[PDB]
Ligand binder design. Structure first.
Ligand SMILES: Nc1nc2c(ncn2[C@@H]2O[C@H](COP(=O)(O)OP(=O)(O)OP(=O)(O)O)[C@@H](O)[C@H]2O)c(=O)[nH]1
Ligand SMILES: Nc1ncnc2c1ncn2[C@@H]1O[C@H](COP(=O)(O)OP(=O)(O)OP(=O)(O)O)C[C@H]1O
Ligand code: SF4
Ligand SMILES: [Zn+2]
Ligand SMILES: [Zn+2]
Ligand SMILES: [Zn+2]
Lengths: 512, 86, 495, 39, 158, 97
DNA sequence: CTTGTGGAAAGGACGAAACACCGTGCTCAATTCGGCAGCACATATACTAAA
DNA sequence: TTTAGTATATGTGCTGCCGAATTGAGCACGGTGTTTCGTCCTTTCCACAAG
RNA sequence: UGCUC
């Protein structure tokens, strides 16, 4: 996981700093270790190690566990450091599904990690008071309403609460409070009657103390999976099937967990009455849609029962496998052309096949299909079976069958995406560093204006800003800006493929 | 038989397939702008601990004028073990 | 004006940290890329080709042609390495057993180590203790390998992990789809039935459907090692700073300088004497070129894998030229000297060039009895005494004696042969020039290579040594005969 | 060890190399320091 | 036909242009049929049945086109449609039909329909790193570094 | 060299080294096997631990941590051969004090 | 007995291929000796079945 | 429900196919070096027909 | 290989 460690290091250096990213990388590479050994191996002061551990555990990146002799060991969560990159997508999806209030709520939750409901609503009000003007003030009523609406939808979840010290072993305080998680009050918001108005940054006891909240990344992952499946089925059959499957997934979200081979089956009557009235669709049309989706060779849904009229169930693992196959074939097509993608789909549909059979079923002349096969072999897109006639395994007396392993190929593609994002971040940082002189020059020549904007602001300071030699450098500045924008866009868009591959690799394991 | 090569292959061999252009739309641009805003605002956040400067040359009267001032967040010591108190 | 930089420091080596280099580090260390399989040019000068083998940018091996990287002669050239890129990765014969061990240690699906959280913590606590020795490291490796081989299912991803063993030569087989006598699992049934098209197009696949386990070629092994979490690397008893799991599979070959590959230009015929390593590297480059040609021309998979196995075998021979699992049809015709053969053996580097090596200022002569000399004295002939010289430093005590010795010259027995000045290290031969002017200009601190005279301590030894008394330091006395004489009472120690 | 000392070309720890020698030079450890007037 | 001759081989020379034209024409026909089926919007089942195209229908269509002089059998068009399926552009379904205008397979009929891809191009391919042929030799400090990369340079310049 | 016809010198075999060790003459053994036989001065980089040339480390592209070191030529040959075998000996130098 | 324009042959580079014409093909082990990996295989422990 | 039988399950325990060692050197010499199998280019010499 | 010891 060297690429993963590099990506985590880059993210922690770009987001938190240097003295903390070293501790994070050390925790990720060595795993759980006490504090003293971490400080000894890192080579820095103890106070810096304490600050790094505290600022990391604040964002739920690392956890602390008790062991024999009451020693505390800190273990980092590389998965969380990787999900950290998905913050822009989280903000975008919570702004699309909800109003800007929930957008700011999730933004504050992700930038602070753990906070109380009162603090987050106060910050949201203070930030939204700047959006509007004309003396209009922001009240906490609507903010708390939006917060509870996000809560009941499992988007925000209460952090693990420390058990009561008086009731649980009253006496000597342990080295660690041993925070535990309770599913009863996991999504129960506290009753806070106090209200207030946000301040406009003029620059001129807590009821919910101890109850910290955070962003439930599992709910965001489930929502992204649902959106991906909906987009896929929309591109395949029609938007009507997309709406049907969206309604089915919305109904199944509550009655199912985040990891299950099959969801709870639904009947035709409930799906019909729960579908929006905006579609002039009858019962027989819904039955036809369901029975034609069940016959789809991709197996997005399944009958799995006949009681209660039309009983159907959604296949999540099969849908994720189909999406992973789509991603793999698309990247193969974009990397080696359409003919190599044809050969890939041929060797994928046929579990085992040889060179002559591939040439016969693909109609690709010789000297070209074998070249693409060997190119894909050199890139770990497929593995050879090599069924031997004799235990000697001599090449001259054995058959070689081509076979694509979806799991290994998906893992390799995920590693490639991680290293690609790492290289993109490295290139962005290099472009920012090499041009930091022009950046500081622009910052200074623009702060000349930013200063004394209104007080003592004479007009004689507007015709001398562009008089400097920065005018011909504005072209290089714009080039750097557009390059950084495109690099960030590519990094964000590769995150979708990373999420698809991670979900495929996660939903195929048992963790037994 | 294979021919002999006098010079080594190019360090960056050319490819006839180019990357697919990025997706366009208001969503992607908004996500880009929000990521840039997060980059700009998370460095000034108290959680972003900077390298402590050391080896000051001299002390001056302008120190109080150039003294960097920034509010510091107070960690919840109830949840955090005792080994992290200053 | 002038910057302060230290000229020389009395640096003493503390310890040697062994490790491995990744292909990127191999590229960084190397200076040029060797891609030409030929050695010399077509012209009659037979000059070495550029960017090819025997290029002078990777050192020099001839007294006339200097190095191209550093402008120095052969005596001062230390040599430079080169990197050769391989089309397909190959298993490192040296780390092949380590590769098998790691593959048995980690999972073949998620690349995680086959250990529970409790066992992981236990091993980390047992390894974090200071003063960990090599024996303890190997014992911990053995224990962890045993406990990992005990398990059969992965606790992280849930994928099945069968036995991993060695088949043939430089081939690894993972028995993922093993035959289950009890109720078979859905995975093995799906794998067996996925051969429908293969059986339809090739019936011979159905009888041989069994024994069709996973074959871990270098590509898949490297892809798996590149995705191993760094947290589990310490559990493999491999130092993270020394190397990484991906370094065991070699993709670049480090061609050594020409100092290690001496070439003799035999002008008496139309050929030159080269070492075996040069021929092995030439064959490896030729095989890489042939593999590239077959890939471009679209050859069959059978011959492609044959060429890949041949390249693996040639690389293994280049590393270790003495293997046992070499097929008869693939067996080498002649015998070549690999690095292992050059290191081990009676004439190896450790026993032939490090433990016992030849020295100068020494002679070998027959012995004869002479009881007229003391037991602590040995007779040296005048002929040998004039050849073995001793460097005496000109001081305020023996200034006149060295003056007289220089005046005598290399002809008269009491004298010297060379003078090294204090300021300049340019030696001066006493046979030429006015020796009197040199004697009159002997400054303090100069070195004079005086002849072996009476009173000089000299080691005397018999080559077959049983005890320490077989070699003793005596006082040399010059005599006109041609044999080493000593008191016969000292014959019993020397035997 | 001794074999590694012989290979690396350094004096082995055994024999005459177990100890170190010091020179009996006319000196004065911790010589007087010049006082600082400005500080 | 196997040892010599063939509708694709012409004088021991494979006609790549011929198979390409066949694939393009078949895909255009299937896409037009699917578009007509979608625009009819009479009923989902009827829409899917109309978007479907039997092997005999497309074979007679190709014969009516008359692109080449060599006679193309039904199995030839079937193999062309199978190659198109392998391209990820069409979908085939085997329905049960005793006898009809096709009468090729006993009690089975293959119907082909143009289908859109599952998902658009992924994000990995949109970055030069995902389509790099020397991606294995990437390293922070060395000759091939992301800072001095030519692929990303040309990609940002474009 | 080996032979007299080749103007070769005598060989201090393993048994001679054993005798010299038994005597404890460390400086004599060092002068015989290091100074008078295959003495050489190499350049080692204190950062990566690799061998340089002319006071320059091509690996790190720097010359501030490069330092001279006395060594038998056979030991340098062994180090080079091991580096060729992917067994990289990293030398961590330090002051003689 | 000297000569010549055209022809054949012999010798020396030279490139495709892999040092054996064809595809075969043997024998002997040089003597311990400390690892091992297979198989096997045994015994007991645990769980299902009959009373 | 409980004692007896069957199966598995790993351990452990006895072989058999591997890989590794076998004194120190000194001195002379004779051999041979990678090549060689077939194809083509070039140069030379001599079967007759001509003075 | 022959030797020398
Ligand atoms: N005349 C002679 N014969 C020798 C020499 N070395 C070996 N032989 C003969 O060759 C056989 C042994 O060969 P080796 O000594 O192993 O040859 P080698 O050492 O592999 O050859 P190189 O590696 O080239 O030194 C013996 O039967 C000897 O008769 C030598 O130096 N001179
Ligand atoms: N192979 C060898 N290894 C070590 N030393 C040897 C060897 N061959 C000869 N020598 C030397 O020669 C000496 C052997 O002589 P030794 O055996 O004692 O007398 P000898 O040869 O039996 O004479 P006699 O037959 O008794 O007159 C001792 C040893 O230093
Ligand atoms: S050369 Fe640059 S663009 Fe290409 S893979 Fe390497 S870092 Fe990415
Ligand atoms: Zn050099
Ligand atoms: Zn696993
Ligand atoms: Zn260096």
């Amino acid at each position: 996981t060297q690429a993963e460690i590099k990506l985590c290091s880059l993210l922690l250096q770009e987001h938190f700093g240097e003295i903390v990213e070293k501790i994070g990388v050390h925790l990720i590479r060595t795993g759980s270790q006490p504090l003293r050994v971490i400080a000894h191996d890192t080579g820095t002061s103890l106070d810096q190690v304490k600050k790094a551990l505290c600022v990391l555990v604040q964002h739920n990146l690392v956890s602390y566990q008790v062991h024999k002799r009451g020693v505390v060991e800190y273990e980092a969560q590389c998965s969380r450091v990787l999900r950290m990159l998905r913050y822009p997508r989280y903000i975008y999806t919570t702004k699309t599904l909800y109003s800007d209030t929930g957008e700011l709520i999730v933004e504050e939750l992700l930038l602070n990690g753990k906070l109380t409901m009162s603090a987050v609503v106060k910050k949201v009000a203070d930030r939204l008071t700047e959006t509007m003007e004309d003396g209009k003030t922001m009240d906490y009523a609507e903010v708390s309403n939006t917060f509870v609406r996000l809560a009941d939808t499992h988007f925000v979840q209460r952090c693990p609460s420390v058990p009561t010290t008086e009731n649980s072993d009253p006496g000597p305080p342990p080295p660690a409070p041993t925070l535990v998680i309770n599913e009863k009050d996991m999504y129960l918001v506290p009753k806070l009657s106090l209200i207030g108005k946000g301040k406009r940054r003029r620059s001129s006891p807590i009821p919910d103390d101890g109850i910290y909240w955070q962003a439930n990344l599992d709910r965001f992952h489930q929502h992204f999976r649902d959106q991906a499946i909906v987009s896929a089925v929309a591109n395949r059959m029609d938007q009507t099937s997309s709406e049907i499957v969206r309604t089915m997934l919305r109904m199944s979200e509550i009655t199912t967990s985040s990891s299950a081979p099959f969801t709870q089956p639904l009947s035709s009557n409930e799906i019909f009455r729960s579908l929006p009235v905006g579609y002039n669709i009858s019962k027989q049309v819904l039955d036809q849609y369901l029975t034609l989706l069940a016959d789809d060779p991709l197996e997005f849904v399944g009958k799995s029962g006949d009681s209660g009229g039309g009983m159907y169930v959604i296949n999540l693992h099969k849908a994720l496998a189909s999406l992973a196959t789509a991603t793999l074939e698309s990247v193969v097509q974009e990397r080696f052309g359409s003919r190599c993608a044809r050969i890939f789909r041929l060797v994928l549909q046929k579990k085992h096949i040889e060179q002559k059979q591939v040439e016969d079923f693909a109609m690709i002349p010789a000297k070209e299909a074998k070249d693409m096969l060997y190119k894909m072999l050199s890139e770990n897109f497929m593995s050879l079976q090599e069924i031997p006639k004799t235990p000697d395994h001599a090449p001259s007396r054995t058959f070689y069958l081509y076979t694509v392993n979806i799991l290994s190929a998906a893992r390799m593609l995920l590693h490639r995406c991680y290293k690609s994002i790492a290289n993109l971040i490295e290139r962005r940082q290099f472009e920012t560093k090499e041009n930091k002189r022009l950046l500081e020059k622009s910052q200074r020549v623009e702060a000349i204006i930013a200063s004394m904007q209104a007080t003592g602001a004479e007009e004689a300071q507007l015709q001398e800003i562009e008089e400097m030699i920065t005018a011909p450098e504005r072209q290089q500045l714009e080039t750097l800006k557009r390059n950084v924008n495109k690099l960030d866009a590519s990094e964000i868009q590769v995150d979708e493929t990373i999420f698809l591959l991670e979900s495929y690799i996660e939903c195929t394991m048992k963790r037994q | 038989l294979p021919d002999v090569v006098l010079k080594p292959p190019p360090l960056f061999p050319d490819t006839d397939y180019k990357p697919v252009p990025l997706k366009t739309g208001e969503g992607e641009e908004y996500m880009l702008a929000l990521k840039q805003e997060l980059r700009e605002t998370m460095k000034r956040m108290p959680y972003f601990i900077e390298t402590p400067e050391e080896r000051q040359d001299i002390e001056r009267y302008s120190k109080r004028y150039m003294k960097v001032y920034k509010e510091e967040w107070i960690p919840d010591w109830r949840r955090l073990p005792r080994e992290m108190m200053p | 004006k002038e910057q302060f930089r230290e000229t020389d420091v009395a640096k003493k080596i503390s310890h040697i940290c062994f490790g491995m280099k990744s292909p990127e580090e191999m590229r960084q260390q190397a200076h040029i890329q060797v891609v030409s399989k030929n050695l010399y040019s077509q012209d009659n000068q037979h000059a070495p080709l550029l960017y090819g083998v025997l290029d002078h940018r990777m050192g020099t091996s001839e007294k006339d042609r200097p190095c191209e990287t550093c402008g120095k002669n052969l005596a001062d050239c230390l040599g430079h390495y080169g990197y050769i890129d391989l089309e397909l990765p190959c298993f490192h014969v040296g780390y092949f057993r380590a590769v098998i061990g790691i593959l048995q240690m980690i999972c073949k699906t998620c690349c995680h180590i086959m250990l529970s959280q409790e066992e992981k913590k236990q091993f980390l606590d047992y390894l974090k203790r200071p003063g960990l020795t090599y024996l303890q490291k190997r014992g911990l490796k053995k224990k962890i390998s045993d406990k990992c081989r005990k398990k059969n299912i992965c606790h992280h991803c849930g994928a099945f992990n069968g036995t991993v063993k060695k088949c043939g030569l430089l081939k690894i087989i993972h028995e993922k789809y093993k035959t289950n006598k009890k109720v078979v699992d859905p995975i093995v049934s799906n794998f067996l039935q996925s051969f429908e098209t293969a059986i339809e197009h090739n019936k011979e696949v159905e009888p041989l459907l069994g024994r069709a386990q996973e074959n871990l070629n270098p590509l898949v092994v490297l892809n798996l090692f590149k995705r191993i979490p760094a947290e589990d690397v310490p559990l493999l008893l491999m130092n993270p700073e020394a190397g990484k799991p991906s370094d065991l599979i070699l993709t670049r070959l480090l061609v050594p300088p020409l100092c290690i590959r001496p070439s003799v230009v035999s002008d008496l015929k139309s050929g030159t004497n080269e070492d075996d390593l040069t021929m092995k590297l030439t064959e490896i480059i030729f095989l890489n070129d042939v593999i590239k040609k077959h890939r471009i021309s679209g050859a069959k998979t059978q011959m492609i894998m044959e060429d890949w196995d041949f390249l693996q075998l040639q690389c293994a021979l280049y590393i270790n030229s003495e293997l046992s699992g070499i097929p008869l049809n693939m067996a080498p015709k002649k015998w070549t000297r690999g690095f292992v053969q050059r290191l081990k053996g009676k004439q190896g580097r450790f026993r032939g060039n490090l433990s016992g090596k030849r020295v100068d200022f020494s002679g070998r002569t027959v012995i004869s009895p002479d009881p007229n000399l003391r037991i602590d004295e040995v007779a040296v002939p005048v002929h040998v005494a004039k050849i073995l010289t001793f460097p005496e430093k000109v001081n305020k005590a023996n200034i006149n004696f060295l003056r007289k010795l220089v005046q005598n010259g290399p002809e008269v027995h009491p004298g010297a042969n060379f003078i090294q000045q204090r300021h300049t290290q340019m030696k001066r031969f006493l046979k030429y020039g006015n020796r009197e002017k040199m004697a009159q200009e002997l400054k303090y601190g100069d070195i004079v290579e005086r002849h072996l005279i009476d009173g000089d301590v000299v080691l005397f030894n018999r080559q077959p040594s049983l005890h320490k008394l077989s070699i003793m330091a005596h006082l040399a006395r010059v005599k006109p005969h041609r044999t080493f004489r000593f008191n016969e009472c000292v014959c019993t120690p020397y035997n | 060890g001794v074999s590694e000392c012989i290979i690396m070309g350094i004096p082995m720890n055994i024999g005459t190399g177990l100890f170190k020698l010091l020179h009996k030079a006319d000196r004065d450890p911790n010589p007087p320091k010049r006082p600082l007037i400005f500080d | 036909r196997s040892v010599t001759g063939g509708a694709w081989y012409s004088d021991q020379d494979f006609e790549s242009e011929f198979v390409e034209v066949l694939n393009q024409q078949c895909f255009k026909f299937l896409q037009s049929k699917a578009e007509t089926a979608r625009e009819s919007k009479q009923n989902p089942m009827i829409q899917r049945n109309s978007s479907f195209a039997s092997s005999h229908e497309v074979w007679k269509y190709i014969c009516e086109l008359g692109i080449s002089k060599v006679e193309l059998s039904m199995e030839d068009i079937e193999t062309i449609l199978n190659t198109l399926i392998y391209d990820g552009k069409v979908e085939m379904t085997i329905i049960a039909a005793k006898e009809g205008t096709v009468g090729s397979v006993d009690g089975h009929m293959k119907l082909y329909r143009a289908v859109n891809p599952i998902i658009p191009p992924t994000g990995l391919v949109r970055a030069p790193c995902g389509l790099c042929p020397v991606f294995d030799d990437c390293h922070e400090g060395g000759e091939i570094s992301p800072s001095n990369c030519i692929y990303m340079t040309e990609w940002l310049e474009f | 060299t080996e032979g007299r016809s080749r103007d070769g010198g005598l060989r201090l075999g393993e048994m001679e080294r054993d005798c010299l060790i038994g005597y404890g003459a460390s400086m004599l053994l060092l002068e015989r096997l290091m100074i008078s036989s295959d003495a050489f001065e190499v350049d080692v980089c204190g950062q990566c631990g690799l061998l340089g040339y002319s006071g320059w480390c091509h690996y790190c592209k720097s010359s501030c941590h490069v330092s001279s070191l006395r060594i038998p030529y056979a030991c340098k040959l062994l180090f080079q051969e091991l580096q060729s075998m992917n067994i990289i000996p990293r030398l961590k130098l330090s002051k003689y004090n």
